[PDB]
């Protein structure tokens, strides 16, 4: 069996031809007080010809605008050290530490999508007093812990059994690992903005951190090796799909300051010119 799928091409409006006029119709006069935005085309104010337009608005869909991978975290960890906390990497999942995707997501108040995650891991050898060795390829474990699960205390802890948490084992030299996550939220959509508190007495914590609760990532070396220690770096890449968005907002003008709040330093509206009439001359002899 095979089914044919028919998808409609959506192209912009054509231009009709128009001649002179002298009448009591007035398309160019209006009143912006009503909140209305004027629906006037060029063929209302000038004489136009007929144009068959073939342009398409397909690259400005939400699916095509948001569906690209972007870095959202970067972390380091060692094979051996005298600290015991630098032996693994750990963090909480959100798209608010790398500003380019934060600004792009925050054009809308509510979003809902499935996610696709890719990792990129690299290693290097710590520069020491003497080199020269032969080392097999390294293996890394990536564990995803849902909210409320037990937390590893070290690299030799029992918790790494991953009896029910989903985990990835990856050895260097192969394709980057990749997996898919569905829409995991207790609400009906994620929220980029929240004007509320956590406690009913109107105090506690304010804003976005009241609603995130989507888990953690832990990353470690599986070998437990390297008489000469190495150090690695992991980078995570999100990509949403099957997206829906609600209630657009104005883009952000000021530079971010931290990942939790929306605090800012006051900035200007735009940059200056010479005067309200200045245009530079470009046709010079």
């Amino acid at each position: 069996v095979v089914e044919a799928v028919e998808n409609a091409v959506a192209r912009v409006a054509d231009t009709i031809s128009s001649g002179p006029s002298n009448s009591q119709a007035v398309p160019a006069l209006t009143a912006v007080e009503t909140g209305h935005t004027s629906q006037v085309t060029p063929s209302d104010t000038i004489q136009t010809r007929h144009v068959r337009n073939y342009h398409s608005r397909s690259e400005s869909s939400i699916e095509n605008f948001l569906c690209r991978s972007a870095c959202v975290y970067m972390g380091e960890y060692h094979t051996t050290n005298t600290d015991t906390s630098k032996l693994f990497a750990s963090w909480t999942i959100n798209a608010r530490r790398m500003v380019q995707m934060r600004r792009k997501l925050e054009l809308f108040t509510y979003v809902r999508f499935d996610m696709e995650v890719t990792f990129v891991i690299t290693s290097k050898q710590d520069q020491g007093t003497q080199l020269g060795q032969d080392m097999p390829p390294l293996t890394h474990q990536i564990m995803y812990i849902p909210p409320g699960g037990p937390i590893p205390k070290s690299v030799t802890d029992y918790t790494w059994q991953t009896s029910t948490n989903p985990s990835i084992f990856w050895t260097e030299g192969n394709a980057p690992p990749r997996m898919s996550i569905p829409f995991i939220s207790i609400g009906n959509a994620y929220s980029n903005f929240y004007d509320g508190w956590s406690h009913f007495s109107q105090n506690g914590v304010y804003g976005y951190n009241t609603l995130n609760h989507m888990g953690q990532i832990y990353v470690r070396h599986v070998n437990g090796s390297s008489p000469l220690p190495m150090t690695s770096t992991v980078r995570m890449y999100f990509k949403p799909k099957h997206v829906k968005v609600w209630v657009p907002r104005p883009p952000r003008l000021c530079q971010y300051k931290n990942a939790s709040t929306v605090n800012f330093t006051p900035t200007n509206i735009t940059e200056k010119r010479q005067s309200i009439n200045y245009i530079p001359e470009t046709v010079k002899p």
Partner: protein
């Protein structure tokens, strides 16, 4: 088993691909869907909404509301120009931080017509007429009302309806233009002149203001995604 061959491009990570992949939580039950008001389906719906333009962007007025209003007054000021600027919706300081400009700065190309709406904000006893003119590229900006009247213009008469529209039509050699514009893909300029002047009775304030709104028409489109040059960070945790 089945004989196969690996072609170039294997085991690479291309950021803009789309393949299927294994799910890490099999048989998950998603929350049902709610009909929320205000669903967006295309960014070209946002660019079709007016937004105030900061035309008066001179020194000393970049962080005040004065940046939005164009001054005008009564008396003999016919030799003086009201305002003027270049049509670069994604590169000019005047247009680049509006809704239309912020949407354009995510793309490389654009095409279509534009609308500039003007609203007069004087008292109800003031009268006047203005000339609003657009000049396609190929010459310098006009320096008198006589030169400006030779382009695409409209004469706006202030009355009950407080607003007027100057539609800027698409007149170009190519089908698209660069958002980072140059001599080769210029679009022209816009100027404003007194047509008869402002007349008021006694007992009113002297000066009046005009405001500008910009939006896109129904034949507008963009293409070739890129990154925006406005936001930037120095380290993580920001």
């Amino acid at each position: 088993g089945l004989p196969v061959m690996n072609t170039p491009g294997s085991n690479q990570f291309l950021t803009s691909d789309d393949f299927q992949s294994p799910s890490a939580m099999p048989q998950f039950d998603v929350t049902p869907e709610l009909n929320i008001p205000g669903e967006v389906q295309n960014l070209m719906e946002i660019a079709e909404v007016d937004s105030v333009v900061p035309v008066n962007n001179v020194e000393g007025k970049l962080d005040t509301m004065e940046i939005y209003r164009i001054p005008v007054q009564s008396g003999n000021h016919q030799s003086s120009q009201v305002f003027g600027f270049q049509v670069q919706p994604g590169l000019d300081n005047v247009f680049k931080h509006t809704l239309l400009g912020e949407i354009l700065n995510y793309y490389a190309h654009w095409s279509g017509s534009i609308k500039l709406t003007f609203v007069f904000c004087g008292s109800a006893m003031a009268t006047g007429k203005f000339l609003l003119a657009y000049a396609p590229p190929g010459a310098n900006a006009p320096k008198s009302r006589k030169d400006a009247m030779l382009g695409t213009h409209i004469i706006w008469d202030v009355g009950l309806q407080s607003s007027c529209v100057l539609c800027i039509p698409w007149i170009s050699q190519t089908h698209y233009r660069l958002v980072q514009q140059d001599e080769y893909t210029s679009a022209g300029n816009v100027t404003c002149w007194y047509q008869t002047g402002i007349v008021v009775p006694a007992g009113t304030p002297t000066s009046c203001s005009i405001m500008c709104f910009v939006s896109a028409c129904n034949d507008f489109s963009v293409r070739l995604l890129k990154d925006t040059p406005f936001i930037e960070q120095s380290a993580l945790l920001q």
